[PDB]
Amino acid sequence: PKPAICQTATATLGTIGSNTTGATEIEACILLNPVLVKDATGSTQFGPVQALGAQYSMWKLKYLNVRLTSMVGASAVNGTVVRISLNPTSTPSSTSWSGLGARKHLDVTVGKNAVFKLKPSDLGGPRDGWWLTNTNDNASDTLGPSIEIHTLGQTMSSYQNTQFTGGLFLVELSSAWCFTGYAANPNLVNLVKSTDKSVNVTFEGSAGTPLIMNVPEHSHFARTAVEHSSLSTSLSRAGGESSSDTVWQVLNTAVELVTPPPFNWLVKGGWWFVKLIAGRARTGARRFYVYLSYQDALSNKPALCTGGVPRTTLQFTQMNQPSL
């Protein structure tokens, strides 16, 4: 399949903040699916990309350059390493830093400038190179790759050796999306992408039962999910509560949440998928099933806890518009 059309785009995606744990922290997670990039200030060039993604059925990338620009000199700060990596299926990983080293990646030391260049062979989809555009399909064929940025090592003011607060790098992305095949339904889609600057989250679960995320009822995120979550639903499991067919990806860059086992790795990884639970509800907050992957969410297979349970800035993306 040769492309019908190829569209280049360039965007500024925000800053990589400094490290306070000393351990691995996630600082960005960038979906490349053409209907999932967000058109906002700094990214207006993604408007056409979304439009094409809604009108064609197959996409691929010609290339992908991610540029890191130092916002702070090496005379000033010390101690932190930044790792840019390619997540090929956009599926959360439990392997932390050493796993990131297995993927195609670039490390840059604080106070330095760099460009992570990717060849088409690194990005290709399973349909003779292509991915599918419609995010209601089987996920292994739709979502395609993601760029993740992680930091390792406490960021210290190089003079007083105290904790440094502030941005280390500016992220700029440049790529070109190719499209072919005609959307059976264009969908015109307008998927919500927003941020909830501060909100309090809790987790409940029990042995054999689904991990649940609670969000206060009048938070911006709880608000937006209830407005935009499809009224069509499904039933998990048994007895077993109904959940919207609309999925949301959640990414937490606020530095520390605890969960029922075995899912400490997931919340520390910083991003997962959720579906809104049907409730009254009550008691207090809105409630969300948590999912280990997009296909798990599409298939109504939530994360199942091994036991009971022993502050955040959320960035969220509507993955989904059910009807299909």
Side-chain angles (χ1 to χ4, degrees), residues 208-212 262-263 266 289-292 296 301-305:
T209 61
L211 180 68
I212 295 173
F263 295 127
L266 180 68
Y289 281 138
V290 175
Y291 299 90
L292 292 189
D296 279 344
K301 303 296 176 184
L304 296 179
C305 304

Side-chain angles (χ1 to χ4, degrees), residues 23-26 96 257 263-272:
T24 314
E25 293 171 12
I26 187 175
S96 220
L257 305 166
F263 295 127
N264 149 82
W265 71 263
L266 180 68
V267 62
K268 140 191 263 163
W271 64 285
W272 53 95

Side-chain angles (χ1 to χ4, degrees), residues 10-321:
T10 290
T12 308
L13 300 183
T15 53
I16 306 306
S18 53
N19 188 299
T20 63
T21 71
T24 314
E25 293 171 12
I26 187 175
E27 288 304 328
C29 184
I30 307 150
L31 299 172
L32 306 177
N33 181 304
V35 299
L36 294 172
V37 297
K38 94 226 133 34
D39 177 310
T41 38
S43 56
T44 62
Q45 281 190 34
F46 285 160
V49 174
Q50 301 172 358
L52 300 172
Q55 301 184 340
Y56 291 86
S57 65
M58 302 223 300
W59 62 284
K60 53 140 114 170
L61 298 178
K62 263 201 195 184
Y63 63 82
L64 179 67
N65 298 336
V66 183
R67 169 178 314 271
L68 285 197
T69 303
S70 175
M71 296 289 82
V72 99
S75 44
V77 296
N78 190 263
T80 298
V81 175
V82 168
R83 169 168 281 176
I84 313 164
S85 63
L86 174 83
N87 194 313
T89 74
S90 313
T91 303
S93 144
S94 60
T95 39
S96 220
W97 185 267
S98 69
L100 300 175
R103 291 149 170 193
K104 168 123 300 190
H105 74 273
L106 181 63
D107 300 348
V108 55
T109 275
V110 79
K112 274 162 167 227
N113 284 333
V115 174
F116 185 42
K117 301 245 268 184
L118 285 166
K119 128 139 237 128
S121 75
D122 314 295
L123 315 166
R127 258 114 185 159
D128 199 32
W130 291 78
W131 304 90
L132 297 191
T133 212
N134 180 10
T135 59
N136 299 305
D137 307 336
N138 285 331
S140 50
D141 311 353
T142 304
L143 239 52
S146 263
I147 295 295
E148 311 191 4
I149 306 170
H150 292 84
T151 68
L152 172 70
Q154 215 193 13
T155 311
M156 288 167 293
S157 141
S158 181
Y159 283 177
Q160 300 106 302
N161 332 106
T162 172
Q163 170 73 49
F164 173 86
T165 302
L168 295 184
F169 300 96
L170 181 65
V171 184
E172 175 236 277
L173 179 141
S174 109
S175 189
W177 282 264
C178 296
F179 300 84
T180 194
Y182 301 102
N185 340 70
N187 268 283
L188 272 52
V189 96
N190 191 122
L191 291 153
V192 175
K193 292 128 199 179
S194 194
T195 295
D196 196 325
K197 174 186 176 79
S198 229
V199 56
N200 308 308
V201 182
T202 39
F203 290 105
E204 35 234 52
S206 53
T209 61
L211 180 68
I212 295 173
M213 186 183 74
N214 311 120
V215 209
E217 228 181 40
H218 299 280
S219 57
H220 178 45
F221 164 50
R223 156 215 210 247
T224 316
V226 178
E227 350 190 4
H228 291 78
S229 290
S230 182
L231 256 216
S232 210
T233 73
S234 36
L235 291 298
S236 181
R237 206 125 231 236
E241 255 142 326
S242 13
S243 49
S244 164
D245 304 340
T246 299
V247 191
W248 303 80
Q249 182 222 65
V250 156
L251 159 79
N252 179 14
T253 49
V255 85
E256 353 226 353
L257 305 166
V258 313
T259 61
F263 295 127
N264 149 82
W265 71 263
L266 180 68
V267 62
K268 140 191 263 163
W271 64 285
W272 53 95
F273 297 97
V274 296
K275 273 177 159 188
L276 191 63
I277 309 176
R280 249 214 102 214
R282 225 174 173 167
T283 74
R286 300 286 173 204
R287 299 156 43 220
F288 283 99
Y289 281 138
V290 175
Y291 299 90
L292 292 189
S293 71
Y294 191 51
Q295 187 76 79
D296 279 344
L298 291 170
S299 312
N300 280 102
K301 303 296 176 184
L304 296 179
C305 304
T306 47
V309 44
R311 103 261 302 294
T312 83
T313 308
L314 299 174
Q315 295 158 76
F316 53 82
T317 296
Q318 183 186 125
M319 299 289 294
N320 214 29
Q321 219 203 325

